[PDB]
Design a protein around this ligand. Structure first.
Ligand SMILES: *Cc1cc2c(cc1C)nc1c(=O)[nH]c(=O)nc-1n2C[C@H](O)[C@H](O)[C@H](O)COP(=O)(O)OP(=O)(O)OC[C@H]1O[C@@H](n2cnc3c(N)ncnc32)[C@H](O)[C@@H]1O
Ligand SMILES: C/C=C/CC/C=C/CC/C=C/CCCCCCC(=O)OC[C@H](COP(=O)(O)OCCN)OC(=O)CCCCCCC/C=C/C/C=C/CCC
Ligand code: HEM
Ligand SMILES: COc1[nH]c(=O)c(C(=O)[C@@H](C)C[C@H](C)[C@@H](Cl)CCl)c(O)c1OC
Ligand code: SF4
Ligand code: F3S
Ligand code: FES
Lengths: 129, 249, 153, 613
């Protein structure tokens, strides 16, 4: 039989009509322009670290490393933490955990330079066995 | 007689819960043409007609044969078979695509994503559709070089692991590069808003700059170069309008 | 807040799943290359460093066992220098590399140096300049720790 | 077996996403219609994308032209089998049509003063055939047809033409001489779709794949000309199968005729520009029907080149590499990739290859399909148009002119959407379908799908293509052809001994290619029988036993008091092959070539002369 249901037009996108109601401008641009410029200003920082040492470097190594890495592991976590394969709630939960990563690393570093040897006297020590 | 041995993704969707098996074919390089596609039509006609895939042009121009030959995304049609018969060349459909069948990936996403970028000419005041040629000096239109040729084969895209992972939200190399082609068309006034469409953190900026896409393009274009230039538009530097239709025009 | 297309994008992914259709083999089957693997290494280093900075950072706070005990509870079964001078190399390289490749990636972000020759140069002149510095930073002060082992005058 | 059917109802349904295909869609959508567009491949994959040399228009960005000189060379190229009304549309409009592309967005290559760059091409000249050689060909450098298809495609998205990609047009929806829609196999899920629509338009391109060797794509099996043969329509001029001069010796993929309009030329065994002898003034820029015959003789007479003395060289290596970049970029490569040739240091292996099909479904100047008994003229078939390669307004007649074809899709594709924004009144609602509407369409699909038999879908084609190539070649004789048509026709039986294997629906490439063969046989046959009967020599078609061009007079002796030859005994007339697809036999008839212009007041009917380039 050619005796069966009337069908529907196939799922297709419609660039114009789907344009009408949805016009926000939330440009991630400006934020991105900085965190490159930041890793671009992290450059002279890292060879100065081979050279200048002590508790004053230590601080702002760990202070600047934090900021790069917070963004970094956000970047990472937004990739692999696909809402498709993870489902919505468990994907907020890797996204929350990514500030819990950031915040922690710091407590851990801050502490390290305060009640252990600091990073610059660590990287001395290991380089001596 | 040297017998080259192929290994090709098979999926049968009609069969009840079927798993994707990798199939083994030998083919006589003596009674078969130079490219891989040649060998694929050989094995369909001669061995096994169920071996299903997409093909046209046959001259490197449509992009319907895009698939994954010996690890890389490239055009089966202009792909030389590995002349070394002791190796064993093996073929897969564009990575992280939903396979309808055998070698035929559900392209529809990739296609819709195209449609997004509004891939026609647009101007700030209406113009008479059948009237005069908008001026574009030779130097302006050299900017579209590297850009219009894209056959939309989706090799790049299906090679960019960004796209594999977040295809929903990341436009992905092929598709972006085209959008750029519309923002530096010295004749297109939508530069402004056409950039506004891909401002957010995923659709555009999800290029973690891997470069896989330019390496795999069979048409030897360069999608990264564009993406780059787009990042520059989303942040610092500008599109620059054309010198006016110098009169007698 | 999804843009018109990505809404649609999501819906597609829903269909494509409901259809029980499988996913075309990717990293399993995609050939090793100097593009992605550079990046991937840039990934691994990036994380693995910050990885350390957590299990290290916090690691030592929330433990007894301070870092100066840890240097001795290793030098206490001191293994021949070469072994050790490789852990030096491993520890240095990740920084050596991720920084090199870093400046690099930014270039790519700025459209600059995005052609396949000047790309592959990139990959080498970085992967090179790293492995070189990393050894020259582990091996050079293992030098003035031997030139001092026997003082000629 | 058991199948699943769907219904839609559209204003206009277009079976093709070609250049013709999409220009219709997009004028028709922007005019405001419920447009469905149905294509067995994704629209950037359509053959139009292969187009290389470009598109004809008198824009004079190089040197003052008149749209009329283009009309001229077009009638010339037509070998007076070409309806001049049709060509009048083609040429006046071309000036605008092309310009419209630039306004759409086609990255036309540029003059220093930013006008569309124009190359020379094969078969065109200024001054009503009495100037120099023309620069009237428009081109995105080298791969023009691609840029136009992607442009025409881009714009197809703005006009809401809900696209039906990867569905296979099976047959027309026929109810007493009027077309109500199509019926399609959906590839992606083996379901069947019934398109109730007020009109239908068939833009399926040519049938080059009916040959062993063609420049065309694997998909050019001309399913359109089947769909309409199978809906009882009679086809015309099938026998006019342009062989392109410059197809790559081995694999058979077009090197542009553009290569010649930039200064490349043909070279024999002893390497002398052997057209400086076959066509003194036009030379290597003669019409293709005459250059490809010119080539073929040099072969049979041993002046060939290669290890075999059976193809010739196309030499480009003299031209400055700085012009081979910008003017011929895309074939510097498609030569390097397939024939090992660095086009700046050696010549290119080229043999004539089946290329374009003037032939198609009969249409009036408005692109509407026609039935025609000797008696009551040519009666319109309502609800049905067709355009492009696949159509036969014969804007081409016996020989296609270079670069006319993309124009002939853009132009008439556009002349569907203009001529339908005409006589479709916002009342006449969506036609209802007959009971059992193409149940016989699907019954064929089934027959084919489970086709047990003993001859593979594969093999059968192979032997058809091989005969078809031997028997319907450049030069045809009554002995070759007559046995051909006998072989061929024993084959159109073997379809009842046909053999599939892929039993399934969802993407069944084995089964579509068997459908594609089924069609291509109805194509193959009607072609060669027309060509066997044509006792003349005009255009692409050329007989070794009827070497004179046979017209209603003789246009060497200045006509003055000649009695007109009678319509039966001369061949300046169209060929309507009419086949019932069941039995599979053909019976001919002949429409008269339409000689008058669209508006005699604007320009004059250009009357038959000596076909000499
Ligand atoms: C073959 C060729 C032609 C060509 C050329 C180079 C090559 C290799 N270069 C040209 C040039 O430089 N200048 C020019 O004027 N013409 C040139 N040509 C000729 C020209 O490209 C073509 O003859 C013409 O453009 C064809 O376009 P058209 O729109 O008429 O048709 P198409 O693009 O070939 O594609 C046909 C469409 O129809 C659909 N189709 C076909 N059958 C079916 C069925 N079974 N079911 C559903 N859809 C069907 C196809 O999907 C396609 O979209
Ligand atoms: C699993 C993976 C394992 C990795 C875990 C990583 C932890 C990451 C910490 C990052 C912070 C690094 C900066 C500090 C630093 O290097 O310490 C100084 C020390 C000084 O020693 P020392 O105290 O001087 O030596 C011991 C006494 N002999 O440095 C070192 O010992 C390591 C040196 C690293 C190479 C130098 C930078 C190279 C970059 C070139 C870039 C330039 C463009 C301009
Ligand atoms: C001058 C020094 C550095 C520069 C210029 C730099 C540069 C970059 C750049 C451009 C990215 C791009 C983000 C992306 O591809 O998504 C990145 C990623 C990242 N970086 Fe750095 N980096 C530097 C040092 C470091 C260090 C020392 C660490 C470890 C503490 C680190 C941790 C990360 C992490 C976790 C990412 C996430 C993205 C990925 O792995 O691909 N970075 N870096
Ligand atoms: C952009 O950075 C990236 N770079 C890559 O090499 C990449 C990949 O190709 C992955 C196979 C490598 C990735 C880091 C691993 Cl460890 C996931 Cl199991 C990848 O998925 C990726 O994220 C999109
Ligand atoms: S960028 Fe290259 S590989 Fe990708 S769709 Fe375009 S032509 Fe294909
Ligand atoms: S591979 Fe993807 S990461 Fe950017 S460089 Fe190409 S789009
Ligand atoms: S089929 Fe056209 S690209 Fe291979």
């Amino acid at each position: 039989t050619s005796a069966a249901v009337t069908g529907a037009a196939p799922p297709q996108f419609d660039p114009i009509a789907a344009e009408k109601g949805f016009k926000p401008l939330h440009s991630h641009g400006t934020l991105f322009k900085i965190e490159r410029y930041f890793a671009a200003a992290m450059v002279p920082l890292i060879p100065a670290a081979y050279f200048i040492h002590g508790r004053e470097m230590d601080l702002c190594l760990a202070l600047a490393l934090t900021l790069h890495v917070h963004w970094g592991v956000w970047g990472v976590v937004n990739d692999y933490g696909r809402p498709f394969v993870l489902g919505d709630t468990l994907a907020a939960a890797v996204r929350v955990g990514a500030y819990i990563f950031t915040a922690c690393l710091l407590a851990g570093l801050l502490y390290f330079n305060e009640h252990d040897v600091g990073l610059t006297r660590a990287f001395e020590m290991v380089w001596e066995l | 007689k040297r017998i080259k041995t192929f290994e090709i993704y098979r999926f049968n969707p009609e069969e009840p819960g079927a798993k994707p098996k990798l199939q083994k074919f030998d083919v006589d390089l003596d009674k078969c043409g130079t490219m891989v596609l040649d060998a694929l039509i050989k094995i369909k006609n001669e061995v096994d007609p169920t071996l299903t895939f997409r093909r046209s042009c046959r001259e490197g121009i449509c992009g319907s044969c895009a698939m994954n030959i010996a690890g890389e995304n490239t055009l089966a049609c202009i792909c030389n078979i590995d002349q070394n018969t002791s190796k064993t060349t093996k073929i897969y459909p564009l990575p992280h695509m939903f396979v309808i069948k055998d070698l035929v990936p559900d392209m529809n996403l990739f296609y819709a994503q195209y449609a997004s970028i509004q891939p026609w000419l647009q101007k700030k005041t209406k113009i008479n559709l059948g009237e005069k040629q908008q001026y574009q000096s030779i130097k302006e239109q050299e900017k579209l070089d590297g850009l219009y040729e894209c056959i939309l084969c989706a090799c790049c895209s299906a090679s960019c692991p960004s796209y594999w992972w977040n295809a929903d939200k990341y436009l992905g190399p092929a598709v972006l590069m085209q959008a750029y082609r519309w923002i530096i068309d010295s004749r297109d006034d939508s530069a402004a808003e056409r950039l506004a469409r891909m401002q957010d953190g995923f659709s555009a900026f999800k290029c973690h700059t891997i470069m896989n896409c330019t390496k795999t393009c069979p048409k030897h274009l360069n999608p990264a170069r564009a993406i780059g230039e787009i990042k520059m538009l989303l942040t610092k530097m500008k599109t620059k309008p054309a010198p006016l239709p110098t009169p007698a025009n | 807040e999804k843009t018109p297309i990505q809404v649609w994008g999501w819906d597609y992914l829903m269909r494509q799943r409901a259809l029980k259709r499988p996913i075309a083999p990717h990293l399993t089957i995609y050939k090793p290359q100097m593009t992605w693997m550079v990046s991937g290494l840039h990934r691994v280093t990036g994380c693995a460093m910050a990885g350390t900075l957590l299990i290290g950072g916090v690691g030592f706070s929330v433990l007894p066992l301070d870092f100066t005990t840890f240097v001795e509870f290793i030098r206490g079964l001191g293994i021949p220098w070469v072994i050790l001078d490789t852990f030096k190399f491993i520890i240095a390289f990740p920084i050596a590399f991720h920084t090199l490749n870093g400046i690099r990636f930014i270039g790519f972000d700025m459209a600059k140096g995005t052609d396949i020759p000047s790309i592959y140069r990139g990959a080498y002149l970085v992967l090179g300049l790293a492995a070189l510095i990393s050894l020259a930073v582990v091996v050079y002060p293992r030098w003035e720790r031997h030139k001092k082992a026997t003082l000629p005058t | 077996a058991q199948y699943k059917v769907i219904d839609h109802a559209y204003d206009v349904v277009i079976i093709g996403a070609g250049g013709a295909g999409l220009r219709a869609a997009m004028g028709l959508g922007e005019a405001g219609f419920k447009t469905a567009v149905v294509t067995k491949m994704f629209p950037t994959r359509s053959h139009t994308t292969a187009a290389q040399g470009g598109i004809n228009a008198a824009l004079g960005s190089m040197n003052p032209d008149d749209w009329k000189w283009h009309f001229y060379d077009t009638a010339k190229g037509s070998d007076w089998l070409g309806d001049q009304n049709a060509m009048h549309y083609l040429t006046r409009n071309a000036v605008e049509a092309v310009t419209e592309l630039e306004n759409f967005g086609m990255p036309f290559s540029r003059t220093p003063e930013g006008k569309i760059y124009q190359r020379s091409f094969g078969g065109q000249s200024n001054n009503y055939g009495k100037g120099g050689v023309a620069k009237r060909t428009c081109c995105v450098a080298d791969r023009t047809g691609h840029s136009m298809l992607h442009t025409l495609y881009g714009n197809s998205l703005r006009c809401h033409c809900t696209f039906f990609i990867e569905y296979f047009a099976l047959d027309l929806l026929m109810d007493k001489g009027r077309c109500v829609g199509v019926i399609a196999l959906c590839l992606e899920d083996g379901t069947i779709h019934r398109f109730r629509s007020k009109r239908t338009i068939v833009a399926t391109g040519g049938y080059g794949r009916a040959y062993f060797s063609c420049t065309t794509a694997h998909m050019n099996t001309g399913d359109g000309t089947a769909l309409a043969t199978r809906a009882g329509i009679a086809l015309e001029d099938l026998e006019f199968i342009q062989f392109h001069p410059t197809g790559i010796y081995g694999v058979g993929c077009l090197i542009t005729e553009g290569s010649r309009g930039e200064g490349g030329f043909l070279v024999n065994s002893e390497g002398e520009r052997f057209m400086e002898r076959y066509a003194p003034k036009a030379k290597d820029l003669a019409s293709r029907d005459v250059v490809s015959r010119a080539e073929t003789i040099e072969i049979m007479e041993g002046r060939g080149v290669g290890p075999e003395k059976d193809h010739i060289y196309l030499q480009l290596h003299h031209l400055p590499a700085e012009q081979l970049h910008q003017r011929l970029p895309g074939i510097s490569e498609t030569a390097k990739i397939f024939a090992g040739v660095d086009v700046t240091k050696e010549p290119i292996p080229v043999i004539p290859t089946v290329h374009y099909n003037m032939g198609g479904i009969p249409t009036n100047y408005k692109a509407q399909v026609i039935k025609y008994t000797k008696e009551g003229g040519d009666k319109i078939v309502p609800g049905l148009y067709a355009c492009g390669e696949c159509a036969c307004h014969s804007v081409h007649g016996a020989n296609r002119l270079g670069a006319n074809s993309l124009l002939d899709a853009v132009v008439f594709g556009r002349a569907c959407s203009i001529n339908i924004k005409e006589e479709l009144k916002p009342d006449e609602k969506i036609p209802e379908l007959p009971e059992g509407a193409g149940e016989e369409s699907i019954a064929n699909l089934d027959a084919v799908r489970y086709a047990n038999g003993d001859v593979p879908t594969a093999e059968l084609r192979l032997t058809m293509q091989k005969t078809m190539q031997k028997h319907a070649g450049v030069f045809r004789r009554g002995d070759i052809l007559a046995e051909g048509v006998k072989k061929m026709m024993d084959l159109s039986k073997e379809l009842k001994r046909l053999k599939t294997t892929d039993r399934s629906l969802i993407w069944n490439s084995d089964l579509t290619e068997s459908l594609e063969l089924q069609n291509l046989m109805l194509n193959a046959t009607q072609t060669i029988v027309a060509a066997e009967n044509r006792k003349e020599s005009r255009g692409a078609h050329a007989r070794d036993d009827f070497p004179k061009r046979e017209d209603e007079y003789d246009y060497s002796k200045p006509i003055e008091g000649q009695t007109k030859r009678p319509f039966e005994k001369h061949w300046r007339k169209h060929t309507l092959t009419k086949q019932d697809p069941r039995t599979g036999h053909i019976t001919l008839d002949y429409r008269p070539v339409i000689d008058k212009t669209l508006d005699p007041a604007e320009v004059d009917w250009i009357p038959p002369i000596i076909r000499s380039y």
